[PDB]
Coordinates of C-alpha atoms in Angstrom, one line a residue:
Chain A
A1 CA 29.7 -20.6 35.0
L2 CA 27.0 -18.3 36.3
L3 CA 29.0 -15.1 35.7
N4 CA 28.8 -15.4 31.9
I5 CA 25.0 -15.5 32.3
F6 CA 25.2 -11.8 33.3
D7 CA 26.8 -11.0 29.9
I8 CA 24.4 -13.3 28.0
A9 CA 21.2 -11.9 29.5
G10 CA 22.5 -8.3 29.3
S11 CA 23.2 -8.8 25.6
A12 CA 19.7 -10.2 25.2
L13 CA 18.2 -7.2 27.0
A14 CA 20.1 -4.7 24.9
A15 CA 19.2 -6.5 21.7
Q16 CA 15.5 -6.7 22.5
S17 CA 15.5 -3.0 23.6
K18 CA 17.0 -2.2 20.2
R19 CA 14.3 -4.3 18.4
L20 CA 11.5 -2.6 20.4
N21 CA 13.0 0.8 19.6
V22 CA 13.0 -0.1 15.9
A23 CA 9.4 -1.2 16.1
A24 CA 8.4 2.0 17.9
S25 CA 10.2 4.1 15.3
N26 CA 8.4 2.2 12.5
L27 CA 5.0 2.6 14.2
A28 CA 5.5 6.3 14.7
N29 CA 6.6 7.0 11.1
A30 CA 4.0 4.9 9.3
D31 CA 2.5 8.0 7.6
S32 CA 5.7 10.0 7.0
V33 CA 5.9 11.4 3.5
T34 CA 9.5 12.5 3.4
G35 CA 12.8 12.7 5.3
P36 CA 15.5 15.3 5.5
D37 CA 17.0 14.2 2.2
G38 CA 13.6 14.0 0.5
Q39 CA 13.6 10.2 0.6
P40 CA 10.7 8.2 1.9
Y41 CA 11.0 6.5 5.3
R42 CA 11.9 2.9 4.8
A43 CA 11.0 0.4 7.5
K44 CA 13.9 -0.5 9.6
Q45 CA 14.7 -4.0 11.0
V46 CA 17.4 -5.3 13.3
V47 CA 19.5 -8.4 12.6
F48 CA 19.9 -10.8 15.5
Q49 CA 22.7 -13.3 15.7
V50 CA 24.7 -15.2 18.3
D51 CA 28.1 -14.1 19.7
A52 CA 30.1 -17.1 20.7
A53 CA 33.5 -16.3 19.3
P54 CA 35.7 -18.1 21.9
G55 CA 35.0 -21.6 20.6
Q56 CA 31.4 -22.0 21.6
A57 CA 28.0 -22.5 19.9
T58 CA 25.9 -20.5 22.4
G59 CA 26.9 -17.0 23.6
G60 CA 23.8 -14.9 23.7
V61 CA 22.4 -12.3 21.2
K62 CA 23.8 -9.3 19.4
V63 CA 22.5 -7.0 16.7
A64 CA 24.7 -7.2 13.7
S65 CA 23.2 -4.3 11.8
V66 CA 20.0 -2.3 11.1
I67 CA 18.7 -2.8 7.6
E68 CA 16.0 -1.1 5.5
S69 CA 13.2 -3.4 4.1
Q70 CA 13.2 -4.3 0.4
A71 CA 9.5 -4.7 0.1
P72 CA 7.9 -2.4 -2.3
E73 CA 7.3 1.2 -1.2
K74 CA 3.6 2.1 -1.4
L75 CA 2.9 4.3 -4.4
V76 CA 0.1 6.9 -4.0
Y77 CA -1.1 9.0 -6.8
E78 CA -0.5 12.7 -6.1
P79 CA 0.6 15.0 -9.0
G80 CA 0.7 18.2 -7.0
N81 CA 3.3 16.8 -4.6
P82 CA 6.8 18.2 -5.1
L83 CA 8.2 14.7 -4.4
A84 CA 6.0 13.1 -7.1
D85 CA 7.9 11.3 -9.9
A86 CA 7.3 11.7 -13.6
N87 CA 4.1 9.7 -13.4
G88 CA 2.9 11.6 -10.4
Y89 CA 3.5 8.9 -7.9
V90 CA 4.8 9.5 -4.4
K91 CA 6.5 6.7 -2.4
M92 CA 5.3 6.0 1.1
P93 CA 6.6 3.6 3.8
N94 CA 6.2 -0.1 3.6
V95 CA 5.5 -0.4 7.3
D96 CA 3.3 -3.3 8.4
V97 CA 1.3 -2.0 11.3
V98 CA 0.1 -5.3 12.7
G99 CA 3.6 -6.7 12.3
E100 CA 5.1 -3.8 14.3
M101 CA 2.5 -4.1 17.0
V102 CA 3.2 -7.8 17.4
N103 CA 6.9 -7.1 17.4
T104 CA 6.4 -4.6 20.2
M105 CA 4.5 -7.1 22.3
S106 CA 6.9 -10.0 21.6
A107 CA 9.9 -7.9 22.4
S108 CA 8.4 -6.8 25.7
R109 CA 7.6 -10.4 26.6
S110 CA 11.1 -11.8 25.8
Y111 CA 12.7 -8.7 27.5
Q112 CA 10.7 -9.6 30.6
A113 CA 11.8 -13.2 30.4
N114 CA 15.4 -12.2 30.3
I115 CA 14.8 -9.9 33.3
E116 CA 13.5 -12.9 35.2
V117 CA 16.5 -15.0 34.2
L118 CA 18.9 -12.4 35.4
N119 CA 17.0 -12.1 38.7
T120 CA 17.1 -15.8 39.2
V121 CA 20.8 -16.1 38.4
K122 CA 21.6 -13.2 40.7
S123 CA 19.7 -14.9 43.5
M124 CA 21.6 -18.2 42.9
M125 CA 24.9 -16.4 43.0
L126 CA 23.9 -14.7 46.2
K127 CA 23.1 -18.0 47.8
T128 CA 26.4 -19.5 46.6
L129 CA 28.5 -17.2 48.7
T130 CA 27.0 -18.8 51.8
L131 CA 28.4 -22.2 50.9
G132 CA 29.1 -23.9 54.2
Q133 CA 28.2 -20.8 56.3
Chain B
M1 CA -2.9 5.7 4.6
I2 CA -3.2 2.0 5.7
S3 CA -3.4 1.3 1.9
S4 CA -7.1 0.6 2.4
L5 CA -8.1 4.1 3.7
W6 CA -6.2 5.6 0.8
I7 CA -7.6 3.3 -1.9
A8 CA -11.2 4.0 -0.7
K9 CA -10.5 7.7 -0.3
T10 CA -9.4 7.8 -4.0
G11 CA -12.7 6.1 -5.0
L12 CA -14.7 8.6 -3.0
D13 CA -12.9 11.5 -4.6
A14 CA -13.5 10.0 -8.1
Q15 CA -17.2 9.6 -7.4
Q16 CA -17.3 13.2 -6.1
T17 CA -15.6 14.4 -9.3
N18 CA -18.1 12.5 -11.4
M19 CA -21.0 14.1 -9.4
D20 CA -19.5 17.5 -10.0
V21 CA -19.4 16.8 -13.8
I22 CA -23.0 15.6 -13.7
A23 CA -24.1 18.7 -11.7
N24 CA -22.2 21.0 -14.2
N25 CA -24.0 19.2 -17.1
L26 CA -27.4 19.6 -15.4
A27 CA -26.9 23.2 -14.5
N28 CA -26.0 24.2 -18.1
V29 CA -29.1 22.8 -19.7
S30 CA -30.5 26.1 -20.8
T31 CA -27.3 27.5 -22.3
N32 CA -26.9 27.9 -26.0
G33 CA -24.4 25.6 -27.8
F34 CA -23.3 23.7 -24.7
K35 CA -21.6 20.3 -25.2
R36 CA -22.1 17.9 -22.4
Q37 CA -19.1 16.6 -20.4
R38 CA -18.3 12.9 -19.7
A39 CA -15.9 11.7 -17.0
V40 CA -13.4 9.0 -17.8
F41 CA -11.5 7.1 -15.1
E42 CA -8.5 4.9 -15.2
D43 CA -6.9 2.7 -12.5
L44 CA -3.4 3.7 -11.5
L45 CA -0.3 1.5 -11.3
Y46 CA -0.7 -2.1 -10.1
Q47 CA 1.9 -3.0 -7.5
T48 CA 3.2 -6.6 -7.6
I49 CA 4.1 -7.9 -4.2
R50 CA 5.1 -11.5 -5.1
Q51 CA 5.5 -13.0 -8.5
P52 CA 3.4 -16.0 -9.6
Chain C
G1 CA 33.8 0.7 18.4
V2 CA 31.9 -2.2 19.8
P3 CA 28.6 -1.1 21.6
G4 CA 28.7 -1.6 25.4
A5 CA 32.5 -1.3 25.5
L6 CA 34.8 1.4 27.0
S7 CA 36.6 4.0 24.9
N8 CA 39.0 6.8 25.8
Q9 CA 37.4 9.4 23.5
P10 CA 33.9 10.8 24.3
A11 CA 31.0 10.0 22.0
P12 CA 30.3 12.6 19.4
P13 CA 27.2 14.8 19.9
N14 CA 24.2 13.5 18.1
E15 CA 22.0 15.7 15.9
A16 CA 18.5 15.4 14.4
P17 CA 18.1 18.0 11.7
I18 CA 14.7 18.5 10.0
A19 CA 16.5 20.0 6.9
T20 CA 19.8 19.1 5.4
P21 CA 21.1 22.8 5.3
Chain D
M1 CA 7.5 -16.3 22.6
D2 CA 4.9 -18.8 21.4
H3 CA 5.0 -18.4 17.6
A4 CA 1.2 -18.9 17.6
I5 CA 1.1 -15.1 17.7
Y6 CA 3.1 -15.1 14.4
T7 CA 0.3 -17.1 12.8
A8 CA -2.6 -14.9 13.8
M9 CA -0.5 -11.8 13.0
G10 CA 0.0 -13.2 9.5
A11 CA -3.7 -13.9 9.2
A12 CA -4.5 -10.3 10.3
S13 CA -2.0 -8.7 7.9
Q14 CA -3.2 -10.8 4.9
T15 CA -6.7 -9.8 5.7
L16 CA -5.6 -6.1 5.4
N17 CA -4.1 -7.1 2.0
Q18 CA -7.4 -8.6 0.9
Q19 CA -9.2 -5.5 2.1
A20 CA -6.8 -3.3 0.1
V21 CA -7.5 -5.4 -3.0
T22 CA -11.3 -5.2 -2.5
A23 CA -11.1 -1.4 -1.9
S24 CA -9.1 -1.0 -5.1
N25 CA -11.8 -3.0 -6.9
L26 CA -14.5 -0.8 -5.4
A27 CA -12.7 2.4 -6.4
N28 CA -12.8 1.3 -10.0
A29 CA -16.6 0.7 -10.0
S30 CA -16.9 3.2 -12.8
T31 CA -13.8 2.6 -14.8
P32 CA -14.6 1.9 -18.5
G33 CA -13.6 -1.7 -19.4
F34 CA -12.3 -2.7 -16.0
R35 CA -11.6 -6.3 -14.9
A36 CA -12.0 -6.9 -11.2
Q37 CA -9.2 -8.7 -9.4
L38 CA -10.0 -12.0 -7.6
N39 CA -8.7 -12.4 -4.1
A40 CA -8.3 -15.7 -2.2
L41 CA -6.5 -16.9 0.9
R42 CA -4.2 -19.9 0.6
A43 CA -2.8 -22.0 3.4
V44 CA 0.9 -22.9 3.5
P45 CA 1.9 -25.6 6.1
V46 CA 5.3 -25.1 7.6
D47 CA 7.3 -28.4 7.1
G48 CA 9.6 -29.6 9.8
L49 CA 10.1 -31.7 12.9
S50 CA 8.2 -32.9 14.6
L51 CA 4.4 -32.4 14.9
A52 CA 2.9 -30.4 12.0
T53 CA 0.7 -27.9 13.9
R54 CA 1.5 -24.5 12.2
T55 CA -0.2 -23.6 8.9
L56 CA 0.2 -19.9 7.9
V57 CA -2.1 -18.1 5.4
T58 CA -1.2 -15.7 2.5
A59 CA -3.4 -13.7 0.3
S60 CA -3.1 -14.5 -3.4
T61 CA -4.8 -13.0 -6.5
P62 CA -5.7 -15.9 -9.0
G63 CA -6.0 -13.8 -12.1
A64 CA -9.1 -11.6 -12.7
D65 CA -12.8 -11.9 -13.4
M66 CA -13.6 -12.0 -17.1
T67 CA -17.4 -11.9 -16.7
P68 CA -18.6 -9.5 -19.5
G69 CA -19.5 -6.1 -17.9
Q70 CA -22.4 -3.6 -18.2
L71 CA -23.0 -1.8 -21.5
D72 CA -23.9 1.9 -21.5
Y73 CA -25.4 3.3 -24.7
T74 CA -23.4 6.5 -25.6
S75 CA -24.4 7.7 -29.0
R76 CA -20.8 8.0 -30.1
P77 CA -19.5 6.1 -33.2
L78 CA -16.0 5.7 -31.7
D79 CA -16.9 4.0 -28.4
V80 CA -17.1 0.3 -29.1
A81 CA -17.8 -2.8 -26.9
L82 CA -16.5 -6.3 -27.5
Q83 CA -18.3 -9.6 -27.6
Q84 CA -17.7 -11.7 -24.5
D85 CA -14.2 -13.3 -24.4
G86 CA -12.9 -10.8 -26.9
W87 CA -10.1 -8.3 -26.5
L88 CA -8.9 -5.2 -28.3
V89 CA -5.2 -5.0 -29.0
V90 CA -3.1 -1.8 -28.3
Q91 CA 0.6 -1.0 -28.1
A92 CA 1.8 -1.2 -24.5
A93 CA 3.9 1.4 -22.8
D94 CA 7.2 -0.4 -23.6
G95 CA 6.5 -0.8 -27.3
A96 CA 4.9 -4.2 -26.7
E97 CA 1.5 -5.6 -27.5
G98 CA -1.2 -5.6 -24.8
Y99 CA -4.9 -6.4 -24.6
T100 CA -7.8 -4.3 -23.2
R101 CA -11.6 -4.0 -23.1
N102 CA -11.8 -0.2 -23.0
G103 CA -13.4 0.9 -26.2
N104 CA -13.1 4.6 -25.6
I105 CA -11.2 5.2 -28.9
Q106 CA -9.9 8.7 -29.4
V107 CA -8.6 10.5 -32.5
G108 CA -5.6 12.8 -32.2
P109 CA -5.0 16.0 -34.2
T110 CA -2.5 14.0 -36.3
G111 CA -5.2 11.3 -36.9
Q112 CA -3.9 8.4 -34.9
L113 CA -6.3 6.2 -32.9
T114 CA -5.6 5.9 -29.2
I115 CA -7.0 4.1 -26.2
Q116 CA -6.1 5.5 -22.8
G117 CA -3.1 7.2 -24.6
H118 CA -1.9 3.9 -26.0
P119 CA -1.9 3.5 -29.8
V120 CA -4.6 1.2 -31.2
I121 CA -3.3 -1.8 -33.2
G122 CA -4.8 -3.2 -36.3
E123 CA -3.7 -5.8 -38.8
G124 CA -1.4 -3.2 -40.4
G125 CA 0.0 -2.0 -37.1
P126 CA -1.0 1.2 -35.4
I127 CA -4.0 2.8 -37.1
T128 CA -3.7 6.2 -38.7
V129 CA -6.9 7.9 -39.7
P130 CA -7.1 10.8 -42.3
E131 CA -6.9 14.0 -40.3
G132 CA -10.1 15.4 -39.0
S133 CA -12.4 12.8 -40.5
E134 CA -15.6 11.2 -39.2
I135 CA -15.1 7.5 -38.2
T136 CA -17.6 4.7 -38.3
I137 CA -16.6 1.2 -36.9
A138 CA -18.3 -1.9 -38.4
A139 CA -19.4 -5.0 -36.5
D140 CA -16.3 -6.9 -37.5
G141 CA -13.9 -4.0 -36.8
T142 CA -13.7 -2.4 -40.3
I143 CA -13.2 1.4 -40.1
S144 CA -14.9 3.8 -42.5
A145 CA -13.6 7.4 -42.8
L146 CA -15.7 10.3 -44.2
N147 CA -13.7 13.4 -45.1
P148 CA -15.8 16.5 -44.2
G149 CA -16.9 18.6 -47.1
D150 CA -16.8 15.7 -49.5
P151 CA -20.2 13.9 -50.2
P152 CA -21.2 10.8 -48.2
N153 CA -20.4 8.7 -51.3
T154 CA -16.7 9.1 -50.4
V155 CA -17.0 6.7 -47.4
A156 CA -14.3 4.0 -47.8
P157 CA -12.7 1.5 -45.5
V158 CA -9.3 2.4 -44.0
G159 CA -8.2 -0.3 -41.5
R160 CA -9.5 -3.1 -39.4
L161 CA -9.2 -3.3 -35.7
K162 CA -7.3 -6.3 -34.3
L163 CA -9.8 -8.4 -32.2
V164 CA -8.4 -11.4 -30.3
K165 CA -10.0 -14.2 -28.3
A166 CA -8.5 -15.1 -24.9
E167 CA -9.9 -16.7 -21.8
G168 CA -9.2 -15.8 -18.2
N169 CA -6.7 -18.7 -17.6
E170 CA -4.5 -17.4 -20.5
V171 CA -4.0 -13.7 -19.6
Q172 CA -2.3 -11.9 -16.8
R173 CA -2.8 -8.3 -15.8
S174 CA 0.5 -6.5 -16.1
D175 CA 1.6 -3.7 -13.7
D176 CA 0.1 -1.0 -15.9
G177 CA -3.4 -2.6 -16.1
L178 CA -2.9 -4.1 -19.6
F179 CA -3.4 -7.8 -19.9
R180 CA -0.7 -9.9 -21.6
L181 CA -0.4 -13.6 -22.4
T182 CA 0.9 -15.9 -19.7
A183 CA 4.0 -18.0 -20.2
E184 CA 2.3 -21.3 -20.7
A185 CA -0.4 -19.8 -22.9
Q186 CA 2.2 -17.8 -24.9
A187 CA 4.3 -20.9 -25.5
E188 CA 1.3 -22.6 -27.1
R189 CA -0.4 -19.7 -28.9
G190 CA 2.7 -17.9 -30.1
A191 CA 4.1 -14.5 -29.2
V192 CA 1.3 -12.5 -31.0
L193 CA -2.3 -13.5 -30.9
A194 CA -3.8 -13.9 -34.4
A195 CA -7.0 -12.0 -35.0
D196 CA -10.2 -14.1 -34.7
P197 CA -12.6 -13.5 -37.6
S198 CA -15.6 -14.6 -35.5
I199 CA -15.3 -11.6 -33.0
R200 CA -18.0 -9.1 -33.3
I201 CA -18.1 -5.6 -31.8
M202 CA -20.9 -3.1 -31.2
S203 CA -20.4 0.6 -32.0
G204 CA -22.0 3.2 -29.8
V205 CA -21.9 1.2 -26.5
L206 CA -19.2 1.4 -23.8
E207 CA -18.5 -1.5 -21.5
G208 CA -18.3 -0.7 -17.8
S209 CA -16.6 -2.4 -14.8
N210 CA -17.7 -5.8 -13.7
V211 CA -17.2 -5.1 -9.9
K212 CA -20.0 -7.1 -8.3
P213 CA -21.2 -5.1 -5.2
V214 CA -22.8 -7.9 -3.2
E215 CA -19.6 -10.0 -3.3
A216 CA -17.6 -6.9 -2.3
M217 CA -19.9 -6.1 0.7
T218 CA -19.8 -9.8 1.9
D219 CA -16.0 -9.8 1.5
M220 CA -15.6 -6.7 3.6
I221 CA -17.9 -8.1 6.3
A222 CA -16.0 -11.4 6.4
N223 CA -12.6 -9.6 6.4
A224 CA -13.6 -7.5 9.4
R225 CA -14.8 -10.5 11.4
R226 CA -11.7 -12.5 10.5
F227 CA -9.4 -9.6 11.6
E228 CA -11.2 -9.3 14.9
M229 CA -10.9 -13.1 15.5
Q230 CA -7.1 -13.0 14.9
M231 CA -6.8 -10.1 17.3
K232 CA -8.6 -12.1 20.0
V233 CA -6.2 -15.0 19.4
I234 CA -3.2 -12.6 19.6
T235 CA -4.4 -11.2 22.9
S236 CA -4.9 -14.6 24.3
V237 CA -1.4 -15.7 23.3
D238 CA 0.2 -12.6 24.8
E239 CA -1.7 -13.0 28.0
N240 CA -0.5 -16.7 28.2
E241 CA 3.1 -15.8 27.7
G242 CA 3.0 -13.0 30.3
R243 CA 2.2 -15.5 33.0
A244 CA 4.3 -18.2 31.7
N245 CA 7.3 -16.0 32.2
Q246 CA 6.8 -16.3 35.9
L247 CA 8.3 -19.8 35.9
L248 CA 11.8 -18.4 35.7
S249 CA 11.5 -16.6 39.1
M250 CA 13.2 -17.9 42.3
Chain E
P1 CA 23.3 -17.5 11.3
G2 CA 20.4 -15.1 12.0
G3 CA 18.1 -12.5 10.6
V4 CA 15.2 -10.2 11.3
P5 CA 13.7 -11.5 14.6
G6 CA 9.9 -11.1 14.1
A7 CA 7.4 -10.2 11.3
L8 CA 9.9 -10.1 8.4
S9 CA 11.1 -13.7 9.0
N10 CA 7.8 -15.4 10.1
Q11 CA 5.8 -14.7 6.9
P12 CA 5.8 -16.9 3.8
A13 CA 7.9 -15.6 0.9
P14 CA 8.7 -16.7 -2.6
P15 CA 12.1 -18.5 -3.0
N16 CA 15.4 -17.0 -4.2
Chain F
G1 CA 13.4 -38.9 18.8
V2 CA 10.5 -38.0 20.9
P3 CA 9.7 -34.2 21.2
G4 CA 11.6 -32.4 23.9
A5 CA 14.4 -35.0 24.1
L6 CA 18.1 -34.7 23.1
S7 CA 19.4 -35.8 19.7
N8 CA 22.9 -36.1 18.2
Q9 CA 22.2 -34.2 15.0
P10 CA 20.5 -30.9 14.1
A11 CA 16.9 -30.7 13.0
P12 CA 16.4 -30.3 9.3
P13 CA 15.8 -26.8 7.9
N14 CA 12.3 -25.4 8.2
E15 CA 10.7 -24.2 5.0
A16 CA 7.1 -23.4 3.9
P17 CA 6.6 -23.4 0.2
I18 CA 3.8 -21.3 -1.1
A19 CA 3.3 -23.5 -4.2
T20 CA 4.9 -26.9 -4.7
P21 CA 7.1 -27.4 -7.8
Chain G
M1 CA -15.9 37.1 -13.4
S2 CA -18.1 39.6 -11.7
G3 CA -21.3 38.6 -9.8
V4 CA -20.0 35.3 -8.3
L5 CA -18.1 34.7 -5.1
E6 CA -15.5 32.0 -4.5
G7 CA -15.8 29.9 -1.4
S8 CA -13.4 27.6 0.4
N9 CA -11.7 24.5 -1.1
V10 CA -11.7 22.3 2.0
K11 CA -12.4 18.7 0.9
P12 CA -14.6 16.8 3.4
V13 CA -13.6 13.3 2.4
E14 CA -9.9 14.1 2.9
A15 CA -10.5 15.7 6.3
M16 CA -12.7 12.8 7.6
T17 CA -10.2 10.2 6.4
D18 CA -7.3 12.1 8.0
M19 CA -9.2 12.4 11.3
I20 CA -9.9 8.7 11.3
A21 CA -6.2 7.9 10.6
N22 CA -5.1 10.3 13.3
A23 CA -7.3 8.8 15.9
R24 CA -6.3 5.2 15.1
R25 CA -2.6 6.3 14.9
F26 CA -2.6 7.9 18.3
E27 CA -4.1 4.8 19.9
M28 CA -1.1 2.8 18.7
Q29 CA 1.3 5.4 20.1
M30 CA -0.5 5.1 23.5
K31 CA -0.2 1.3 23.3
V32 CA 3.6 1.6 22.7
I33 CA 3.9 4.1 25.6
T34 CA 2.1 1.7 27.9
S35 CA 4.3 -1.2 26.8
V36 CA 7.5 0.7 27.6
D37 CA 6.2 1.9 30.9
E38 CA 5.3 -1.7 31.9
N39 CA 8.7 -2.9 30.7
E40 CA 10.6 -0.4 32.8
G41 CA 9.2 -1.6 36.1
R42 CA 10.8 -5.1 36.1
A43 CA 14.1 -3.6 34.8
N44 CA 13.9 -1.3 37.9
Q45 CA 13.2 -4.3 40.1
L46 CA 16.4 -5.9 38.8
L47 CA 18.5 -3.5 40.9
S48 CA 17.5 -5.2 44.2
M49 CA 19.9 -7.2 46.2
Chain H
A1 CA 20.8 4.4 14.5
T2 CA 17.4 2.9 15.5
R3 CA 15.5 6.0 16.7
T4 CA 13.7 8.0 14.0
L5 CA 11.3 10.7 15.3
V6 CA 8.4 12.2 13.5
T7 CA 7.4 15.9 13.3
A8 CA 4.2 17.4 11.7
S9 CA 4.8 20.2 9.2
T10 CA 2.5 22.2 6.9
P11 CA 4.0 22.2 3.3
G12 CA 2.2 25.3 2.0
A13 CA -1.5 25.3 1.2
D14 CA -4.0 23.8 -1.3
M15 CA -4.6 26.1 -4.3
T16 CA -7.4 24.1 -6.0
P17 CA -10.3 26.5 -6.8
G18 CA -13.2 26.1 -4.5
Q19 CA -17.0 26.3 -5.0
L20 CA -18.5 29.3 -6.9
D21 CA -21.9 30.5 -5.8
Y22 CA -23.8 33.1 -7.8
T23 CA -24.7 36.2 -5.8
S24 CA -26.2 38.9 -7.9
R25 CA -23.8 41.5 -6.6
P26 CA -21.7 43.6 -9.0
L27 CA -18.8 43.7 -6.5
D28 CA -18.3 40.0 -5.8
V29 CA -15.5 38.9 -8.1
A30 CA -13.9 35.5 -8.8
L31 CA -10.5 34.9 -10.4
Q32 CA -9.3 32.3 -12.8
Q33 CA -7.1 29.4 -11.5
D34 CA -3.6 30.4 -10.3
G35 CA -4.8 34.0 -10.1
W36 CA -4.7 36.3 -7.1
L37 CA -6.1 39.7 -6.1
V38 CA -3.7 42.2 -4.6
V39 CA -4.4 44.1 -1.3
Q40 CA -2.4 46.2 1.0
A41 CA -1.5 44.3 4.1
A42 CA -1.7 45.4 7.7
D43 CA 2.0 46.1 8.0
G44 CA 2.1 48.4 4.9
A45 CA 3.2 45.5 2.8
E46 CA 1.7 43.7 -0.3
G47 CA -0.6 40.7 0.2
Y48 CA -2.3 38.4 -2.3
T49 CA -5.7 36.8 -1.7
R50 CA -8.6 34.9 -3.4
Chain I
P1 CA 26.1 20.7 31.3
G2 CA 22.4 19.8 31.0
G3 CA 19.0 21.1 30.0
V4 CA 15.3 20.4 30.4
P5 CA 14.8 16.6 30.9
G6 CA 12.2 14.6 29.2
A7 CA 9.6 15.8 26.7
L8 CA 11.2 19.1 25.6
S9 CA 14.7 17.8 24.8
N10 CA 13.6 14.6 23.0
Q11 CA 11.5 16.5 20.5
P12 CA 12.8 17.8 17.2
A13 CA 13.4 21.6 17.3
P14 CA 14.4 24.2 14.7
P15 CA 18.2 24.7 14.4
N16 CA 19.5 27.5 16.5

């Protein structure tokens, strides 16, 4: 059925947009020292998984949740900082800059691929309506 | 703060502090009963990314 | 509240505070 | 995408990790009794079906460099330097036993010997010196204390520094910079290292850091070139996928 | 069934 | 089977060990 | 202390490092902006027919 | 929640003492660390300086 | 209703 392709590709587009948004947020806040609660900015990551509940193996993509990374927060020595711990260490984000740049580019590419899939399926469905004049 | 522009900045600051100590020692040569200073440095916490 | 669905109630207004107070 | 970008990206990120290790080594070029960290790339091949074409790269640190360091002559009887392959023993942060090379021994007001704030360990445990007394350290670690006011005939031994022998392959740098015995080495040599009577120390000389500058420079040059190479591969892969996406049209 | 789609799942890691 | 063909069973899990046991 | 004057406490190493980080952080933001702008065009073209 | 913006703030100032030059002037005065001179501000208020 | 579109609205502002 070509109609379900609309839902599949729309889900893919939304998920990749969310992934690119997460990557952009990580890139922007790579040097943030604090948040509103005084906690360091932890790198965010989306969780991709299929959505084929009505008895299928393939159904597209959906973002289950956004999770903060468990890699070690970078400790910088600064004793004058109000946020420094007992040893004088301040926690800083664990953002991987090269990783987030590659994530941005890859998300853009797969987003574009899904755009092309949607356009092709729309063209095919348009051509179908002229079956036998 | 790419973790390599911070680590080298820390070293630059340490060398500048050592140079300040040396300049203070040299400027106070003619003073009476002056005890020379010596700068001591220690590396900070080592961060373990992945266990052996 | 599944994203992309339709709900009777309007979405709550989002806020981005710089300080908790 | 083509996951070839995820190979060059890993190679570019591990290069930044290597640069962060090298810069950390360079920052400690004046730290007394410092052991430079060794950095090395290792290739891990992804196993699976069908054609093995992907081999990622990760930065690892195979121990440290034990090459004896420089010796600065400071006319101070408390600053000692160890013979090559010899370690001083101190009490670690969590009440454990750790090894070091920094001989900058300090005397507190109460009379306890410390190194970098950690208590110094002898054969009798932590060493306590008579309060406000001159200290001389022998070649084999014996400590003589002279009480001010009393004649120099009063000089008598007090305690002996614990000096141990350990190679590079047996010790591992803990997170606080203090070396400790590795698991395999600990299982064979016991929990606590017995003092070696053959270790000699020199009083009045302080050991510096063994950070080799030429190797550091060459490493930074090579790291920059490798990072640029991976960036050129990443750009090529991205450009390839951008046109390949045109196959889905019409 | 899935995980982080990108850098955090295409880098070697020690086992659990 | 040959690459790009169709099989009746899933491919085995993909794992890259940093150090072999 | 009389007879001495206190100057500024601006650290040059910190300022230079901060400026380098600022420049190379902007460039990345400009790359992300360009990527999003390029992405929006094909999404807009999706609305045809 | 995927969008996290960033804003640049100035958390106070740096109070590390600066360089001290020696001008043979009896009026030039320098203060010990964490010490301030007191002046009368423009708006009839009280201000502290180094 | 609505306000300034674009840069001014999607920028953090002091609470008021």
